[PDB]
């Protein structure tokens, strides 16, 4: 099987560097080097993310889409930056304006064809394609607009292969932009109707989870990114490993989406202990479920405790008892019968790889489909209206060839999306 990553925008891009920083080491691939793999198993399934050309050069099969040179020229001028074949860099030296409209209708719409071109060169690579990974932020141009287009096109070209989306939904407390809800509401819209698996991460849900669950005092972006990339590795790549009970994107999809919206999840990693001290090793297993299922530790902003779950997928990856795994999951399902929805006898989807995260003994990625994420699109949707009402920075959109009915559309859509999700919380 296979997949083809997609680094839309700067963020989605910045993260690319971290997702690939990791993944590679979790596959023994040095900058341009080959497979130094401490083992021999980190190779029989690599294909999922690379391509064979030389014999020591397995190049990441991702796409780097962005209308701001400097960015990709920071990712390509640093560490692992020199492993991507230049063909991968689909830049847009234009003005990468922070407008969803500027990267979806006017500026991005041009650079698109020169992207799809490659997304096809990579898809028609070889063997059988599974789906595409998509990273980006719903709070900018090259991210929400142009990346949200990249998919609307992808999903017309292969409505068969899957589409996981890793979105950095606009953090609450403080937004890293001003129109944010504009660029956001507009991209979520496109999401709820193309990709079929979305993993929403919040820069501040991370800080928290990174400053209190990792006594880490100076959580640089690199970190946040790093933590995130840690989860997306547990998801995909991982399951493309052996296991007593293994799954793969689809299983994950076909066990997690009760209703076609596409629904968004909230990823959570397992061993998340501070370096030295904490290295408690309390990782027998009840310790991992202890972790994963708590409020804090959910990369999302919202707290599960604020709304039932529809599905859950503990994708563990480290030798354990299909008994102490299958078992724990249960008590968990009974101690919290309250929030776990009922019309699904077994919400949880236990998954079990074998080999764990390179240096760790036992981990377990969590992919939750809780109704709690209602209380986020609400947020976003609110911010919109409060500012849409006055058409705040709307001239930067319309003046870019947009529509007063376009914004209406998205909000509503994504706004209805909130509605539905409640239809199950009850």
């Amino acid at each position: 099987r296979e997949i083809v990553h997609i680094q839309a925008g700067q963020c989605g891009n910045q993260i690319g560097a971290k997702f690939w920083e990791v993944i590679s080491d979790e596959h023994g691939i040095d900058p341009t080097g080959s497979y130094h793999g401490d083992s021999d198993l980190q190779l029989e399934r690599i294909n999922v993310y690379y391509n064979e050309a030389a014999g020591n050069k397995y190049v990441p099969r991702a796409i780097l889409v962005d209308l701001e040179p400097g960015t990709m020229d920071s990712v390509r001028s640093g560490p692992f930056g020199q492993i991507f074949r230049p063909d991968n860099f689909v830049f847009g030296q234009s003005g990468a304006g922070n407008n969803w409209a500027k990267g979806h209708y006017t500026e991005g719409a041009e650079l698109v064809d020169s992207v799809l071109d490659v997304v096809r060169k990579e898809s028609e690579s070889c063997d059988c394609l599974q789906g595409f990974q998509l990273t980006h932020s719903l709070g900018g141009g090259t991210g929400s607009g142009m990346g949200t287009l990249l998919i609307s096109k992808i999903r017309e070209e292969y409505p068969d292969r899957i589409m996981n989306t890793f979105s950095v939904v606009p953090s609450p407390k403080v937004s890293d932009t001003v129109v944010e809800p504009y660029n956001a509401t507009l991209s979520v819209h496109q999401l709820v109707e193309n990709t079929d698996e979305t993993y929403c991460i919040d820069n501040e849900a991370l800080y928290d989870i990174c400053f209190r669950t990792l006594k880490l005092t100076t959580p640089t972006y690199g970190d946040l990114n790093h933590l995130v990339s840690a989860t997306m590795s547990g998801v995909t790549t991982c399951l493309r490993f052996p296991g007593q009970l293994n799954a793969d994107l689809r299983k994950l999809a076909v066990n997690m989406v009760p209703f076609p919206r596409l629904h968004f999840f909230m990823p959570g990693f397992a061993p998340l202990t501070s370096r030295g001290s904490q290295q408690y090793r309390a990782l027998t297993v009840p310790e991992l479920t202890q972790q994963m299922f708590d409020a804090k530790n959910m990369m999302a902003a919202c707290d599960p405790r604020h709304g039932r779950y529809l599905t859950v997928a503990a994708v563990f990856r480290g030798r354990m008892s299909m008994k102490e795994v299958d078992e724990q999951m249960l008590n968990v399902q009974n101690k919290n019968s309250s929030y776990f929805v009922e019309w699904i006898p077994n919400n949880v989807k236990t998954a079990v790889c074998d080999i764990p995260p390179r240096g760790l003994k036992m981990s377990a990625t969590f992919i939750g489909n809780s109704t709690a994420i209602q209380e986020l699109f609400k947020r976003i949707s609110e911010q919109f209206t409060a500012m849409f009402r006055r058409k705040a920075f709307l001239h930067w959109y319309t003046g870019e060839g947009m529509d007063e009915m376009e914004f209406t559309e998205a909000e509503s859509n994504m706004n209805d999306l909130v509605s539905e999700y409640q239809q199950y919380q009850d």
Binding site: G70, N98, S171, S175, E204
Partner: protein, 429 residues
């Protein structure tokens, strides 16, 4: 990628020489042009040894541009790029815009079309002018004017030094500034503002010195500006393009004018004291005594701030220091704006003049923003105008220079809707 710059008016040129100084100073390029892309968005690698500037200089009296071609830096620019009109400056808009200023414009443009070509996919022109002057108000008025048409497809961020609230110089100043605002308004992208007087306070209160030479205020803006282009167009952990600004900074087409502010302003001689915390500098940003503008947040609700940091800064430190702020409430942000905080993180710490009077910290915050505050500053400057116009005062000086009762009265009405604009976009929910 790049951003040309047109320093217009003696002042815009003095400030220019300054901002231009700080530059090489933090790029290892001696005044001889030679250093031993990155920063190419402000310097062209002409010949095979040098670093010819990436801007131009426009004054109608030679005096001031002359001094540049005397003092080291003399070697820095191209003999060509420093435009002059031996003729007369005239502290009057009209003459500088219409009558005289006209003659030079072509030639002026030519360079910003000759320098705009040589490059590689540019982003815009950082314009440097002094609102209340002759060559600075008038001229530019039509320079930016002729730009908005020749390159509507770019950024027009004009960095102005608008009229000291009580310590103005020219007798007419307002005539010249109500006129540079109305003519440039429909042409700029984002107009940065640095108040000459409100900067003195900083030199008195936050650095201590009753001996502030113009050469200092210049070192200051010369700093805040370095935080804009220089370092930003320079790689970092959270890059921010020029476009970025206007996008994340202007809510509405009016060439909106944010305010420049810097965090660490502390005098050398203090240079040894234990440095300030990420939290303190952040907080210093919300103090109406450190903002290079006599527009004390007397009520003006911020509506978007671009916190450009530089030096050793942990993104969480920021995505926390800002969080704390977002909840101080006494800092009331506009309604229609959930989050209006563009966090720009650079790497390389600031770079203080070897021995001026600037502390020299290992991190700073050049936060700029649009604040419903200027509702004031414009008001107080508009009123001025009327008083004189109300009696025609120095009107005969413009009329006789190819202007009319029109341009004045019709540029007054102009700003009028700038007093209503900056009022409506705020104060209301």
């Amino acid at each position: 990628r790049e951003c040309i710059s047109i320093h217009v008016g003696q002042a815009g040129v003095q400030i220019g020489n300054a901002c231009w100084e700080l530059y090489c100073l933090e790029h290892g390029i001696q005044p001889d042009g030679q250093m031993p892309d990155s920063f190419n968005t402000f310097f062209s690698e002409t010949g095979a040894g040098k670093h010819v500037p990436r801007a131009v200089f426009v004054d109608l009296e030679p005096t001031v541009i002359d001094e540049v071609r005397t003092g080291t830096y003399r070697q820095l620019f191209h003999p060509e790029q420093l435009i002059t009109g031996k003729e007369d400056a005239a502290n009057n808009y009209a003459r500088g815009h219409y009558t005289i200023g006209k003659e030079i414009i072509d030639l002026v443009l030519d360079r910003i079309r000759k320098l705009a070509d040589q490059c590689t996919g540019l982003q815009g022109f950082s314009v440097f002018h002094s609102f209340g002057g002759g060559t600075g108000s008038g001229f530019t008025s039509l320079l930016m004017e002729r730009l908005s048409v020749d390159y509507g497809k770019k950024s027009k961020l004009e960095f102005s030094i608008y009229p000291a609230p009580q310590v103005s110089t020219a007798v007419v100043e307002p005539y010249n500034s109500i006129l540079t605002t109305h003519t440039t308004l429909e042409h700029s992208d984002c107009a940065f503002m640095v108040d000459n007087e409100a900067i003195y306070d900083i030199c008195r209160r936050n650095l201590d010195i009753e001996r502030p030479t113009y050469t200092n205020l210049n070192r200051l803006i010369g700093q805040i500006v370095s935080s804009i282009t220089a370092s930003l167009r320079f790689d970092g952990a959270l890059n921010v393009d020029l476009t970025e600004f206007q996008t994340n900074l202007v809510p509405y087409p009016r060439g909106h004018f944010p305010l420049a502010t810097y965090a660490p302003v502390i005098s050398a001689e203090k240079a040894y004291h234990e440095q300030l915390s990420v939290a303190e500098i952040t907080n210093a940003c919300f103090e109406p005594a450190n903002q290079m503008v006599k527009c004390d947040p007397r009520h003006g609700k911020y509506m978007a701030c671009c916190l450009l940091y530089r030096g050793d800064v942990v993104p969480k430190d920021v995505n926390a220091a800002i969080a704390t702020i977002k909840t101080k409430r006494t800092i009331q942000f506009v309604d229609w704006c959930p989050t209006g905080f563009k966090v720009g993180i650079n790497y390389e710490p600031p770079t203080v003049v070897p021995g001026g009077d600037l502390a020299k910290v290992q991190r700073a915050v050049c936060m700029l923003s649009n604040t419903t505050a200027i509702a004031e500053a414009w008001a107080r400057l508009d009123h001025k105008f009327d008083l004189m116009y109300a009696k025609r005062a120095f009107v005969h000086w413009y009329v006789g220079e190819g202007m009319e009762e029109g341009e004045f009265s019709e540029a007054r009405e102009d700003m009028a809707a700038l007093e209503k604009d900056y009022e409506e976009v705020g104060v209301d929910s």
